[model samples]
Every structure is written in structure tokens, then in C-alpha cells.
Target chain A: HSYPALSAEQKKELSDIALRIVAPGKGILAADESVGSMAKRLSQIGVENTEENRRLYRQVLFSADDRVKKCIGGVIFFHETLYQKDDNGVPFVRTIQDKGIVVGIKVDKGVVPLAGTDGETTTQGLDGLSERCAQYKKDGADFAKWRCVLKISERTPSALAILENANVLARYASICQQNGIVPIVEPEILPDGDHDLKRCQYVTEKVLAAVYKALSDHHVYLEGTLLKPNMVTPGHACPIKYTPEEIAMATVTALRRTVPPAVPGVTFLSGGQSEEEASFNLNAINRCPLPRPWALTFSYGRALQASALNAWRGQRDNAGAATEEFIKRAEVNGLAAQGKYE
Target chain B: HSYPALSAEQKKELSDIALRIVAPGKGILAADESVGSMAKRLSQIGVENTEENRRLYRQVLFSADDRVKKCIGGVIFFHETLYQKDDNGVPFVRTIQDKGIVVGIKVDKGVVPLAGTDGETTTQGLDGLSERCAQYKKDGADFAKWRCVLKISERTPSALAILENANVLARYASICQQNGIVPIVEPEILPDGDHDLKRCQYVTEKVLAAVYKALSDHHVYLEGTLLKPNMVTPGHACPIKYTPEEIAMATVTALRRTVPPAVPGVTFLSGGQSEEEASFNLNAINRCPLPRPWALTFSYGRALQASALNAWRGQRDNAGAATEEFIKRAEVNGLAAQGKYE
Candidate 1:
């Protein structure tokens, strides 16, 4: 038997992050990179993929002078870099801590296919997560991240997939809180289909409804968890493109309809959007006049890395250059988070 | 989010089962024994616990003059026994087939403790269950069984466990049907600890409510599933030992209130009750005036075996004696199933 749904107190804790993250002229900096994804970014930049290169990228992010932190209050990390030290072996976790930013780790390994669902996914890596969370929490991690993938299609994103994924993520969140790590509940609906923006919005609404119920059933405290979801957008194959404003408004409407006002934040995954595009979208989401109950921001990866990696060639001699690229991206996302970046 | 409550079809299926099993003068005879479970039973009775002994047990059960078939619509078995050769090595599965008994297999590996719940559990062995189920169906299993355990206490029987277990069972049931195996969904609330009958009733009500809701959410065919629940009774430590009539009424009341009327049957688990006590309880439950939505019957093991074992000690010279003991127990349960036993 699980605990009751998000306690009233958990609701407040999450809301506070939502308020500050989307407060004004601020947005989340999506940096939670998986190993495979980081390799993809590194491959793009022609940088030699090494543990050192990853540390350098994240170190640049954490050392982004105080201004970037002002715009970005949190930074997500791949598990490897969450514990990596600087060139001097200074703990990167402490470096982010020194900047007063909450450190979040991408807890879910990746999505695997559901047996009966048509091309839908559920997150894995729940096998030994609790002990890892305890260690990460002790090492200065305050929050954890897990992403469950949902895809919309004709009879795709099937009910089995949605329900199974929701339960799995909730299980992950509950285990994280037991180790004192706030959970970032990410059920990311992929926008990689030919579905229109409205179709995207409809699917997101239904998926989140199942998610919250599963979370409630598993008794995960919504207060201690942050929802890291994908904003509703036209599928990549859509006949027509939607403006950031349209995406934001549609996404907000769906969330408000399905998410209980008790959840604190709803940070959107950038999917594969470009860095500037991610920021623009965040800004547009904030500009919309909707009764949003949670913070709207980014928990993105590729969007935050593409430009910065293209600028850094994986050499210590270029550390300053890489860090500069990192700071610029963080600042842009921070600005978009608060809808202050034009 | 998820689907609404039980559909009309599902409710009808579940209710029908509840009503039939608990129908006037009726109870189940759980000849559906898993391999490991049967091994234990064989060893206890001093049998060799080999394939032959297994076959012999079926011969004793299925060869009961065809009259006992009226009492047993289903007989659960282990994979080995289901395909094992009779005296002539003809598959024992056919023995029951000839008797017009539906064959079932226990699909659950067992219950695993819910990480954070107070002594509550989630059923296991679902990792590759669908494939296993399909194979079992091809090998002659028409029905599947999965038992989820819920223990009662002040802080026990957590809501999370209830929902989590319910959802798991639904998934299992759905998988079974895809392969044409009707599922015997068993959420057995153990009569352990000092909790009273009222607590048992309250918990059973809540559990059945969740179970039915989950089945709907997963779109399981209730007409194609059976419920194997513990009969509502006082806790093991209860000071007062109530009569079978009290247990029967409480059980039927809970079933009537929570289980939708669409289900086909509810076969009661013997769960530590004595053989005579289990039989008496089935008799009483069928006699109760409470409106049942499904069949109420017995799916017993130890309760069906303890007396028979004492009567047969595994000697070849005692084989005839053992057969009589087995036949008498089956006959008594058959009579109880029909509400004809005193």
C-alpha cells in the first residue's frame, strides 16, 4: 500500500519552485544529459568524447558567473558529471552549490518499449535507484529527474503505455523522496509525429490525467516533486507550424485542465528544439494569459548543449571559450524562464 | 486520465461470477494446484512428489465418477503436470478436458514486499509474463491465476499498495486474455494479525473497489476473468471465533457492495483455514441472503489436503487408501459447492 496523494505541504514546496522559476524574466536551464545524448552532442562538436570533456562542459555551466544563476536557479546533470570534479578535481556538485543552484540528476536510464503498446515507451532504471539516490543526496543533490516517454498516433500512445509509464515514474518518485531527494516527475510526450498542435494538446491532457492519478495512487507527494513534461507542440511532421505563443497557450490550457493545482511546477522538456527556439518557447508560454497552477520552464538537454558544444573543441586551452558558451546559453534560458527575454 | 470506472460489460462479467460462485447451494473446489504447491502437498502425504504422483493426483480428482465435475468447473495446475503423461503417459490435461473442467495455471511467481508500505505487497513475475502466458495457453491453460497479498493493520494496507497491486493484476489479466487465457485474478487479503472481522470487511471492500477500477482502466474483459479472494473473516488473533454464517454474510456483503455484477465468479482461498472449516464456510457463504454479484466458491489447498494426507501415508499398499481419501475430500467439497453439505 502506498501513501496518500501529494500531501498539502508537498504542494507548497513544488509551487515555490514554480513561482521562482517562472517568476519574471526567468526560465529553467535544461542540462540533464544522458550519456548517449551527450555523445551525440560531442559528436556534433567534433570534440573527443571523454569523461574530462563532459566535466568541462558541465563545469563551464556551473561556473557561469553569478548572472547565469540569476536566470537559471537549477542545473540538471547526467549521472556521471553529477559527481565529476573540475580539472583541479573540485566537485562539480559543490561548484553548482556555490552558485546556489539546486542540482538535479537524470535518474531514469531511458525509455524501453512497452510489450503491447504500439511504439510507446516507459522509463526504466528503477532496479537499484534508492541507494543511488541516498548517495547522490549526501553528495549535495537536492532533486532527481526521470522521464517517461509518450507518443501520439492512431492507437499509439496506447492506454497500456500511458498507465504503465505513469505508475513506473510514480514508483521512481516515491523511492527518491524516501532518500530525501525531491523528484522531478517527467512524463515527456514526444512531439515527433505528424499530429497537429491541438492533437498534441489533447494527448498531453489525457496522458497527464493518467499520470497524476497514478502518482496519487502511488502516494507520491506532489509537493516534493516537480513535473518535467513536454509542452504541447505540433508534431515535427505537422503540415503547419505553430508559434511559441500558440504552443505555450495550448500547453497551459491542457495542464490546467488535468493537473491538480496542488502540483508545484511543470518544467517542459525541450525535446530537440534549438537553444534559441527553447528560450523563445519558454518566453511565449509565460506571455500567454492562462491560469497556470505550476511553474513553466525548461528541463532540456540538447537545446542547452547544441550551441555551446559547437563552440567548445574539448581542449583545456578552450575551457574559457566553452564556459563562455555555456554561460550565454544559461543566461538565455534563465531570461526565457521568466518571460523577460524578447 | 485513465478510463472511467468499470464498463457495463466488465461490471456484468464480474457480477455474474460473484453471483454464480455464491449462487444457491454452490462453492468452488480449487483443484487448480501449481507445480510447487502440489509438490509440497505430495510430500506432506508421503507421496514421491514425482510426475507420476502428480498424474495420480489428477487421476484421483478427474476420475471422480464424472459427478464431481458438477462441483469443479475449473482445476488449476502446474505447467509440468498440465502436460505430463497419465498412466499411459497421455497428457493429464486431457483428463480434466474430458471431464469438462476449465484448466487454469498459477501465473504469479509470488508477492514481493512494497518497499515503503507497512508489510504490504505487490505481485511479481510480470517481467516476461505475456509470453509465458501465450505459451501456457498453447499448452492448454485456458485460465490464469495471480495472487496479490494485502495485510491489515492500523498503518497497514496502504492505499499505494492497494492501487499498485490492483494495477499489476489488471496488467496480468490483460496479458492473459491476449493469449485467450481467462484470468483468475486473486487479491488475497490474509487473515493474519489481531485485526477484527469488521476491519477485514472494510479492507476487502476498499480492495475490491480498487481492483474493479483498475480492471476497467486496463480495459480487461471481466467476463473473461475470475476473482480468487480470501473469504472475509476475523483476523487470526481475533478473540471471538465467529460461526461460518457470520463470515459468509460479511464476505457476500463486501462482494455485493464493491465487485461490479459483471464478473463471472469469486473462488475463495482457503488461507490457513482447516478443511472442515473451509467447507463449512463455503456452505454458509452460499446460504447467506446477501446479494452476490458473482459465483462464490472454494479455491482451496491445505484446507482440501490436510485431512486427506492424514488418511494416506504414501505406501503402495495404501495407494487405494489414498485415492479414497482424495475422492472423499473432493466429494465433500463438491457437495459444499452445491450447498448440499451439512
Candidate 2:
């Protein structure tokens, strides 16, 4: 019943891109924030969300010195950023491509409410995904990202939530592959709960299991896809505390049980973690002493940009400092992805 | 991370009830058609869908000879029939209880369309299920039934359908257990396609695997839960034909891969099969040369009633003959459940 839909060449191309994104000490730079979310990020530091300001902020991260060429294997872009250019009129996609990094695009439209459940939601943006993927490929993206979210609590993330999110992820993946775009399958279990580490571990396992199973059912080629998931950590407000080692252990165990070895990488979302904390957890995860068959690395947004943004403060005088700050974190996480961070 | 939620005593109670329902040659009688569906069944036979007629038709099955006491361990009821009484003024609940059969109530409010997909659906009725379970328990119901539907096609039963439906079934199971009622978890994959035997088996395995993983995630007490699943068979219009033994092998193999031994029974739903064909398949399934830890039996509605309904045909003089017709099917299925049917 399981037929091979991808020809040998097609599979090799997708798997190759997925592998490179999490290769050795390299990971993804998730700069793909939606318009409203990007506004919030800029406004937090008092920077306006104008096209120039947005371009400058992203340029700061993307223009970091050649250290990034070794540390960043892929860069994800929001729809607006994918078509934007740097100060020298170089397209952002071309700048990243020249740095030897794979270019990816964020394709999810955002979340939609599921009727008959308590605030549970499934991601939208699938309506015109095939055409979007095709154009994105022509526009310079070799891969795409879609986010489906789940949260835990006494009665939250109800059955509808988990199933709906998993299904949408698979659908997104299926559509992307048809257009020659490797899909970064992201089913992010939100850190917004009072659940303990054990509970988080339980929910993460269940969520990932549903995801991979859905991927298989849809006949999505696993080798051509990457999983972008939240690390298994205690809820943000949970009374119980856990060490980075514990988080790493739980995260690795959950992934092992659910993720098939055929998947090339697991680029983790840095869900609300501070820069140092996210790096520490990734390092601990790489050293967890477990059977992790896939690349365990970061696909972060705020954690990757927070310090650099503070350094730049939307001004040209601080641009060089901001780029250095961004480069330092990338270098640190590069080591973390290989379990060699000091 | 999977902790036991049910107490030792609670676990014993649920496992005991589930085992007894499929004890030896016993199965269930799914007389739990919703009002609209019942209307269609009645209208098909040219019988008016009146309260008296519904009561009388059910009474014909309940009043069968003592063989039902051994051949049938449970009878699921629509809410209307749950409180209805026979001509002698004996409540249907008491009538079934007197014959040593457990009374079960259908708890689902039917399906709601899931937006953002190609016309997939999720089950409703969880809004006030806790109170309903409590009331139904006091009203002589010892177990409950809820159904979540899926369809097979090239892109149908999309990821959302499988994930949403499995989660709903788990939620329903969790709620039922909190009220001391065993839950017959039915995630029914519809038989309305032209899929071959292999495709049916493939989809069934994937669907059931998702179901059991969800059950574990919610920490539902599996020992107390019964799976009411569709037996593996080719789609309604599949060009390739299959024997009962082939279906039995596929059905049993699918269950073996997904259903944990903690579950006590798998009382199957007869999804549109003719009466004799249903019995033959059940017989072949019981004799499938496989290790089935759970009792494999029938929880049929139309397959158990088509012949009896035709015999009665809204006629008073046909009562005895109708009872005979129902009993014969029950006796045959009883033998089939034990692999003793020729």
C-alpha cells in the first residue's frame, strides 16, 4: 500500500537540503515572523515596523561576518522578507544563498479556531499553498516552513486540538513537496501551561506520535521533511523545576519514540527561552547520552535575535556591534548543536 | 510518564465489565441508532417512526428466548429507547437488566464539519458529557458508546480527520470512566470507497495506531475500555474480491499492531455488511491464526436486525417469527465469536 511517490533524484534533493540544515554544527535561523508578530518584536525595543527598519533589523542578522557561513545552514524568511533586498540592493535570498545556506520560506497563514472545542485551533494558509510553494521555489526558496500549535492544561489541547494540528502539518507538508519544497513540519506544543516536566513529556510524545503517523498516512516522504518542535520542558509557570539535563533527556526520549529515523533533522523552536538558556538546553540535548538519530538543533526567532536587537537599537552607529552579538550567539549554538559548547 | 489514573479497584471494575461484555461467545447489540437514522431505517421498511413502533421493534429483540442471555452481554440504546417501556410496562432498562445484559447509552451528538479541510468532521457532544454520564449511570446504564467517523480516499480522512476523531474518542472514553461507565471507543472508518483490501488494511492500521496512542496520551484507563472498530474489508465498490479469511487476517493483524493487551475486548461494528456475511467474517476473524488477546466479537445493528425487521414487517402476527429470526443470527454470531461457527 505504501508506494514511492518521489523519484530517486527528487528524494535525494529534499533529503540533502534537510540534512544540510542540521549538518554537524549548523542549524536554522528562523527569521520568519508574521506581520503583527514582527510589529510586536520591533515595538518592544521602540523600533517602528517600517519596511526600512524591518529590512535593517533582518540585515543585521543576515550580514553577520563569515562566521555565519559556517554556523547557519538555512535561513527562513517571512513572505515580505523573502522579496526584500539588503542595503546594497542585493536580494536577501541571494545574500543568504551566496553564504552557502539553503533558503526557506514561511508559508503558514496563521491559526484558525476549531468549532465545538475550548479555544483549540488548527493552522490555516493551506488554501493556496500549492501555488504559493511553486512561486516560492521560483522566487529562491528550496524549503518551506508551516507552524501548527498545541498547548497543554487540565482540559486544553483537547483531542480536537492535537488531531487538527497534526493533520494540518501533514497537509502542508504534502502540498510543499508536490512543488519541490522540503517542508519543515512544525507542530509546536506551546509552553503556556502549568504542566510539570513529566506532563510536558507526555504531551510531547503524544503530539509527535500523532504528527509522524499523520505524515505517514498522507504518504509524505519523511526523508524530505524536517520536524520543528518545542523542546520538552516544564510549563513556563509550572511549580516544578527541572535541570537542562532533565529537559534534554525528556525531549530526546519523546523524539526517539515518535520520530522515525528517516527524518533528516529536528530543528527545535526556542519557545520563549532566553538566549543563554536556549543554548544551554541545546547543548545538554546534544550530550544527553540517548539514541538521537536525527540532528537536534535550533530554528529560533527571539532567542536568536533578542540580544542583537538590543545592541543595534534601530541605529546605524550600533550596526557592527549588533552583527557581532548575532554572530557570537550563532557560534555558541553551532557548538551546542554538536555537544561541544563550553 | 504514563501514570495510572484509575485506582486498582477502578481498573479491576472496568476490565471486568469489558471482559464480561465479550465473555466467551457474547458480544453487543448496537440498538443505539440516533432518531434521524432510526427514521431512515423505519421509513425503508415502510414502517412509521412512532414511539410505540420503536418500542415494539426493540421489544421483539429483547423478548427473544433465553439464548440472548448467553449470546448477548450488552445492548446499546438511543436516549429515546433508554427510558421507554415494553407493552407490559417494564422499562427497557429493567427488561434488559433482567436478562443479564448491560445497558449502554449512545453519547455522541453526531458530527460537525471541520473547517480548513476538504469536508472532514469531528464528533460533538462533549459540552455536557460529564453530567450526561452521571445521569445515565443512575438510570441503569453501565457503559457508553460514542462514534467518530473517517472515510478512505486519495485525500479524504485527511490528517485532521484521523487526529481529531482519535482525540475525540479518547476524550469520550476519559469522561465515561470518570462516571464509572465503561466506554466502547468506536472510531469508525467508513466503507464507502473503491479501495482494495490492502488499502483498507493500510488505513485501518494507521487509524487504530493513532487511536491507541491518543488513549495512552490522555492517560485513559485502557483496561476498562473496549474498542468498537470496523473489521478490515475492501471498500464497498472495490473491484478486487476477498474471502472472509483474508478480511479476518487483515482485521486481526491491524488490531494486533495497535491495540494493547490492556484492552479487554474488541466488539466490532458491522458497517453495512449483510447479516450472514457479517457472521462469516466474524467467524473467520475468530479463527484467524493469530494471537488476539482481546475477545473479538460483534456489536452489530443492521446485521443483527435486517432479517428480523423483514420478518416482522410492522405486523403483530409476525412477533414470534421475528424473535426467531433475531435469535438465529445471535446464535450464529455467538458461535462465530468463539471460532466454532462452520
Candidate 3:
């Protein structure tokens, strides 16, 4: 009955990859926004949602100076970006890998309706996932990401959503591992509701408990996986505000209770926090006087990209300024990941 | 944000059906064994596993005199038995329905391996389940049973198995309700380990907690659902034994912590228990001085049929004896449901 789905060698490879991605003073750059998401971001800067624009934007991040190599341990790419090339003709995957940073791909096909829920959903894209992972691996991905979203409300994030999402994420993680790729397990609790900090913390704890239990059930090698969770905070519409210390206390406490020590790190999603706010919160999380077992770091998209995009504004003449903005955020996040940022 | 998956009217219908099945002093007859399971049972009595034999055996129970009308509230049929007819050409569904008994069906395609686990599994059959439920509804099945198994041991029912099974059961429940059928949510924790009573109780609580949470998440109309849970007992190979009162305490306490009041009933499965033992346990569960909100009753298979099969031995001449034996167990179980059996 003890049919371990992963061999010792497989487990070690996954663990090593996971550990490398969250090395001290390092974190992830979540540039894996879908095409639709890319369009929204592109529109903000008056850029067309063309494939070349997407490639040019990503090239800006991948082409950051050597200083970024110290902060960003990994770079996550959407499917399209992984195969795109820099103007000089180097593939983005090679561009990131050549810098000693790990390459990851977002593998989920997006959310689908969970028929009997209150507008909640479970992520799909599990169909032929193993083969997709195999192909992604062959194409140079060392890790994979699949995000499952949960929202809070008085009678929301129902038990079904929590369980269904957790199981789907676990399944995705298992498949990714089977193809020799580490999985960044992201069970993001959205900040859209009017709930308070304590409520978010409670839901986070319950949600992570379900997630970890599922990973254990699926025989997921925890040491080979990284958790990309939301930093426990108040819902966006909540009237109350909380200090970074309180948020850190709540976030760390939830992680402690649910996330096993075997997981290499807890990489937090910024969840729409402004650039400065994300760094400050992550900084406070590292500064919190809690005995966190795993590395607490960032894996942000907008929090890492917004300023860069604003500086670019679809102007070739602004490329230098855009790359500088990207570097500055990475540097600050790197300092935050180490509790060294003011 | 509170998107109610079921309407008030839909909720009422589901609840009413659940309440009727576990009405005061009434329980369920779980005769819905699959053909494979039937083969195993028939071999014990030297009977051939033919469709007619299966139908004939079921007829013996379904054709019981009016006395059983007071004890048996529902009869769960296999897909084959639902369309079967008695010797006089009366459909088995009609036979059960005429006695005011609800007819149920086993709908799951059975368990499938969950990759990455230590030989653990999750139940499948979700493919086309909605269509199947609709068809079964028209075929006279008022409710459905889907059993998801778990095991207790040093490392299991792994968190993966627990979460996967719970979600699947919830999904099945949701689909069944959509087709106007009450769902008997059976997440059976097998008594296959050498663990003690406390461990079994702990696992049972954890499993049921996940199950109910999943049910809530899936927007399953709990009032239209019956819980078919294993009565908390030590693993079969355990070196120690406990009193029926001890077992009852463990079982009820576990249920109290997890099962909500909205569920119409908690129908205990007589998993491998002798007929007398099963009844005794039910009586003790009802007698336990716990503030149970739902009806506590039986949904037994082997325990309900062992004596009847022994008496019949697949012989035409033993038909009267088999029917008498079936009635006797049903009568005892009826009393047990009310805490009146001694």
C-alpha cells in the first residue's frame, strides 16, 4: 500500500529546484499574466495587445541588469513568452536561464464554473497536463504555476470552493512533479470583499489547511513545492485598516499553523497592493518576530511590473527608464525578503 | 456574493425527501451492491451471480410483508435491480414504491487511483454524472448513493484521499439534487488498520469535517442529503476492544463536531458488522446522551443481508425463511433508530 508516487531521486530534484527559487534574499517575478490580463495591462499604457508588444514588454524584464540576478531567483512566463525571443534573437527562456535564474511556466487554463457554488470556480487545464508539463520541461521550464482563487464574504468561499480548489491545485502540483518540474502552489484568497483582517486570516488558515492536507494526500513532495499564498490582510472593501505588523502576525501565524516546514518557502502574491505597499508589507512580514520555518518572500506581477509599464508607456525611447524601474522594485523586494528594507 | 446554488423551492424538495427517508423509527436497506460485489457475496452462499439470481434475491427482501413497511423507509438498488421485475412481472422499483419506501441507486463508477499517493484513490464516475442522474430520476430513483472510501493507518487516509473523496462526494450530491434525488453522502473510513479507537475517532472527525465543509462549498442542499458515515470504531486488527457505549460516544461526538443541523439524517453504515452488532451499535448511538440534531439511523448492506442469505442459500424452497430473516433485522433496526432496541 505504500506506493510512493515519487522516487527518492525525483523528490530530491524537486526539493532542490524549490529551494533554489527561494534562496535567501531572493524571490520570484510573476510575469505569467494570461493574454487577456496582458491586454488589460497593455491598454493602460496605450500599447496594442500584439504578440510582439508582449514579447517586447517581457524582454524589458528579462533584460534587467545583473543587479536583478541577486534578487529574482526565478522568472515565471506565460506560454507565449517562453518561446519568444529578444530583439537580439535569444529566447526569453534562455535569457533568464543564462542569468542563473530559474524559468517557470503558468500551466492552468484559467478558472471554470463549479456548477453548484455561489459564483465560485475550480481551475481547469488539467486535461493533458502531464504532456503539457513534459513539453514545458523540454522547453526549459524548471517550475510551473497554477493559481486557484477564493473570495471572502459572509457565506462565501463556501466549503465546496475551498475543497474543490485545493484538490485541483494538488492535482496540478502532482502532474507538474511527474514531469520533473517544481510547482508553485498558489491558492489566492481574493481581497475583493468587505471582510476585516482577522476574517482574511481565518479564511487563509482554513484554506491552507485544506491545501496542505491535499498535497499530503496526493503524495506531493512538499520539499519540492513552494507556496505562493496571499499575505493575510483585510478585504479591499473593508472599512477597517491594519498595521503591517498586524498583517505580518496574522499571515505568519496562519502559515505556521498550516504550511509544513518541508515546503521550501512561502512566496506571497501582492494581490493588487500598490508597489510601495507590497514591499512594505513583505518587509514587515520578514521583520515580524515569528519563528517562520520557510522563507517568506514575494512572487508578484503588478506589484513588480506596474511602475515599469508606466515608465515605458509604449515608448522605445523610455526603455532605459522602464528597466531601471523594474530593477528598483526587484532590489527593494530582495531587501524586503531579507528584512533589510526600510 | 452570496450566490445561492439552489432555490428555496429546490431546497425544500431535497430536504423533504431526506426527511422522509429517515423518518422516526425508519432506516435504509442498502442492497445496492455492484455486480462485482454481488459476485463475492453470492459465492458465500454457493449461488450463481446471474442477473435473475440477483433480481430474485432482491425480490425476497422487497416482497417482504406489510410489516416491513413500518421499518424500512428506503431501498437502494444497483443499476441492474432498478429495472428488474418480480416473477409476477412487477418491477422492483414498483414493489418498493408501493410500500411507501423510497427507491435509491448506487451511481459512482467506483474508485480510481490518485497518482502520487501511497496506493490511495479517489472515486470517479463524475463524467456524464448529470445525465445519468437525470435518467435515473426518470427511472424511479428518488435518491442516490455514492460511496468514497478512506483508510486509517500510520500515514493515511492521506490528506489527499480525504479531500479528494469529500469533494467528489459533494459533487455527486450536487448533481443528484439537480435531478430531484436526495444524495446519501457516504465517505466510509475503512476499519482496515491496527489503529486504536482514539485514532479512528480522530480520523473520522477530520474526514467528516472535510466532507461537510466540501458539502457547504459545493452548495449541496444539506437538507436533501443523508450522511452515510462509518460508526467510529477501532481498526479491525487492533489489539484492544471498547464497549458499545464507548463506540457510541466516539461516533456521536465526531458527528456533532462536523455534521450540521441542516442535514436530515446521519445513516450509519454497518461495515462488516454482524446483524446483531450493527443494531446494538445503532441503539447505543441513539441512547448516547448527546444533543444530536439529525436523525441517527442505519444504511446497512452486509449486516442487513447476512442472515437472510444464510437462511435462503439460493434455494426456492427457502424463500419464506429468507423473507422472515430480512424482516427480523429490519424490525430490530427500526427499534434501534429510536434507541428502543435491547
Tens-digit lDDT track of model 2 for A18-40: 78888889989999988789898
Candidate 1 deviant stretches above 4 angstroms: A1-72, A75-101, A109-132, A135-140, A153-171, A193-219, A249-264, A287-295, A309-324, B1-145, B151-164, B176-183, B192-206, B237-265, B283-297, B301-342
Q: Write the per-residue lDDT of candidate 3 for residues B14-104, one digit (tens) a residue.
A: 8888888999999999999899999999999999999888988998888899998888889999999899999999998998898899999
Whichever of 2 and 3 has more DockQ, that candidate is: 3
Off by over 4 Å in 2: A1-4, B5-342
The per-model lDDT (C-alpha) reads 0.73, 0.87, 0.89
Candidate 2 — which pairs collide? none
Rank candidates by lDDT, best first: 3, 2, 1
Q: Mark the regions of model 3 whose C-alpha exceeds 4 Å error after superposition.
A: A1-3, A8-112, A115-120, A123-163, A172-217, A221-342, B114-118
Residue-wise lDDT of candidate 2 within B1-342, one digit each (tens)? 356567778877777887778899998998998878888888877889988888889888888878888889899999999999888898989988988888899999999999997777889999999999999999999899999989888888777898898999999999999888999999898998899887887788778878877876676877688999999899999988899999998898677656655577899988989999999999999999966667899999999998998898888889889989999999899989998999
TM-score of chain A of each: 0.91, 0.98, 0.99
Question: 1 or 2: which has the higher DockQ?
Answer: 1
TM-score, structure 3 vs. true: 0.61
Q: Which candidate model has the greater lDDT, 2 or 3?
A: 3
The candidate that wins on lDDT is 3
Residue A333 of model 1 has an lDDT of 75
